[PDB]
């Protein structure tokens, strides 16, 4: 996946803990230990590391797509916390980088549905301290991201983040004096910071740390959550949960505020074992009926809102029709359903405003308890599966391709009720079915000409902006300014007479004379050229001849 670290480089991050070290050094150590614990996992060969600091552009992206691991280390160890607490601009810059390359590659197919197989997994971790949000004018009470629309195409999604990326926050609260009381909580508390509502919206969690042991627990938990998936918002709608006849309905059950109403939670996307890209079949549908004459598509939600109905049904699993199935990671919905203990019943998940005539949506999937009752899976079929699947059953039971008449009228009714972007996969569906006669090239349109032209032009501006951003990373009267001392000056004492101090001048003069009277094979322009950072045995031992095999 993509691991991005947003390291706070405000001056408030220069406080010193009880360990005798600064907060920023603790952040660097957290990044290092995250590296070690992630490298312990035998699945992290491909993991792109990125770093963003709290510094104004273009000095904002320390490491991006075109850098490597060594430059990430060098820029990590050379961070100075000398800025303000400007969280919104830095978060927008990180999301702009990630969504910029996202819209460059066309990973998110607007208009053609939402395909959670096209996935670029990404976890961003903001390590900060929880101080007051500061600008050049004053303290800001509540965290607002800027809305300047720098990336072309930002108006087609309401939120600056996406459904393939997750935000976590390490808020350092190490006290100056160590606490006499020892923390014994197994779980990590949430903080009362200004970043916590944002990470709860994006489908993450804010780890609050007050001790180095607590930092170890937080960072182990953060390592355990770096996997590939899609965060979707599950909500119920309409009927109440069905009371079991064996169960007893009680007034004490809360009918107004129940913990699994809404959950922005993850579903798992396993890679393809043979290739890596999960070869998928069915999209999660849109929140609008596609008007093929509208000039612009409506802006899409960053996180899909899917409504589940708890009415018990029968899980229809037809042979040789490829459905797609996900595992949904633990959530109060999942512990409820695992308490229900009914692997013969499923709940019906649908997407609202996906029907031409009804505000309610015809069901597109079902959530289902597994055989071993270890996890709750999500099964997705094409749109309106209880209509489509029995007729496919009937064609491979009786009709043998060339069909009857009423069943033709059933498919004309179905394709009038069918979404047009689903016209993509369903055609591909019969390419596995064994009935290519249902393929008709007459209908292939899913979008208007205007939005396709807009998408092409947006892709072109995205390519230009990607080139710009990748080139940006890694880089006596009223006109008088007194020069400041430069640490990276390298004062060359042999190239220039101006750089020799007085108190050793005669000394250096004699040395200079010796150079011009040495007449050696190699002439040096510096008195002391020791090294820069590292003195390796292997690097210098390669520049010699060692003719001793000794066998």
């Amino acid at each position: 996946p993509i691991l991005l670290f947003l390291i706070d480089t405000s001056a408030s991050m220069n406080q010193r803990s009880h360990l005798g070290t600064t907060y920023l050094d603790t952040a660097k150590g957290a990044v290092e230990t995250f590296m070690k614990l992630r490298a312990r996992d035998p699945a992290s060969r491909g993991d792109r590391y990125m770093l963003v600091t709290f510094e104004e552009p273009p000095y904002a992206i320390k490491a991006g797509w075109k850098e490597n691991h060594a430059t990430f280390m060098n820029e990590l160890k050379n961070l100075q916390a000398e800025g303000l607490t400007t969280l919104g601009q830095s978060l927008r810059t990180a999301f702009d980088l990630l969504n910029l390359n996202r819209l460059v590659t066309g990973i998110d197919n607007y208009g053609q549905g939402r395909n959670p197989f096209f996935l670029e997994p990404a976890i961003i971790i903001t390590i900060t301290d929880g101080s007051k949000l500061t600008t050049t004018s004053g303290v800001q009470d509540e965290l607002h991201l800027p809305l300047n629309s720098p990336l072309p195409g930002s108006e087609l999604t309401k939120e600056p983040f996406r459904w393939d990326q997750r935000l976590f926050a390490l808020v350092l609260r190490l006290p100056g004096t160590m606490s006499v009381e020892s923390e014994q909580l197994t779980g990590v508390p949430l903080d009362d910071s200004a970043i916590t509502p944002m990470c709860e919206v994006t489908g993450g969690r804010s780890y609050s740390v007050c001790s180095p042991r607590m930092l170890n627990q937080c960072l182990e938990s953060l390592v355990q959550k770096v996997q590939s998936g899609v965060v979707i918002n599950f909500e119920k709608a309409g009927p109440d949960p069905s009371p079991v006849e064996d169960g007893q309905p009680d007034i004490s059950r809360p009918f107004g505020s129940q913990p699994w109403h809404s959950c922005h939670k993850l579903i798992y996307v396993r890679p393809n074992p043979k290739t890596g890209v999960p070869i998928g079949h069915w999209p999660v549908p849109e929140s609008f009926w596609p008007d093929q004459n509208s000039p612009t598509l409506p802006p899409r939600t960053s996180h899909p809102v899917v409504k589940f109905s708890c009415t018990d049904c029968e899980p229809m699993v037809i042979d040789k029709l490829p459905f797609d199935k996900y595992e949904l990671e633990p959530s109060p919905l999942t512990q409820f359903i695992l308490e229900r203990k009914s692997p013969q019943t499923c709940w019906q998940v649908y997407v609202s405003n996906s029907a031409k005539y009804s505000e309610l949506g015809h069901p597109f999937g079902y959530l289902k308890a597994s055989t071993a009752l270890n996890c709750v899976n999500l099964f997705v079929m094409p749109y309106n599966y209880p209509v489509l699947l029995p007729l496919l059953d009937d064609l491979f039971k009786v009709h043998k391709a060339k069909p009857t008449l009423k069943w033709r009228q059933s498919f004309e009714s179905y394709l009038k009720t069918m979404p047009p972007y689903y016209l993509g996969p369903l055609k591909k569906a019969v390419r596995m079915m064994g009935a290519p006669n249902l393929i008709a090239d007459s209908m292939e349109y899913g979008l208007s000409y205007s939005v396709i032209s807009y998408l092409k032009k947006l892709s072109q501006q995205a390519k230009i902006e990607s080139d710009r951003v990748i080139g940006s990373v890694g880089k006596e009267y009223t006109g008088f300014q007194v020069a400041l001392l430069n640490k990276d000056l390298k004062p060359q004492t042999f190239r220039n007479a101006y750089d020799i101090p007085r108190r050793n001048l005669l000394d250096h003069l004699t040395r200079m004379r010796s150079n011009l009277l040495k007449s050696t094979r190699r002439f040096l322009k510096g008195q002391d050229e020791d090294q820069v950072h590292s003195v390796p045995i292997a690097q210098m031992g390669n520049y010699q001849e060692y003719l001793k095999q000794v066998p």
């Binding site: 220069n14 010193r16 000398e82 101080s131 500061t134 190490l174 006290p175 004096t177």
Partner: protein, 82 residues
């Protein structure tokens, strides 16, 4: 707004001992880094890096350090004027 100006007739660095808010020291470090003060910046870093003015200390320690600095600053003003 006051710290942004460049015509102070009182001391700059020797009054940095009577500050106990991390936010104002944060702004001081930012101003000194922008405007070229490479030495007042280090004074601000030393002030922030004290184990007495951390934000996450127990409240008694913070309020007692605050009242110590209040006493010393008000005595310094009574030294100058009064």
């Amino acid at each position: 707004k006051s710290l942004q100006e460049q015509n102070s007739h009182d001391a700059m660095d020797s009054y940095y001992d009577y500050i106990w808010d991390v936010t104002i020291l944060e702004y001081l470090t930012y101003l000194h880094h922008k405007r070229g003060e490479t030495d007042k910046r280090q004074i601000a870093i030393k002030a922030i890096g004290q184990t007495e003015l951390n934000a996450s200390n127990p409240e008694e320690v913070l309020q007692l350090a605050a009242q110590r600095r209040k006493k010393k600053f008000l005595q310094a003003m009574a030294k100058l004027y009064f």
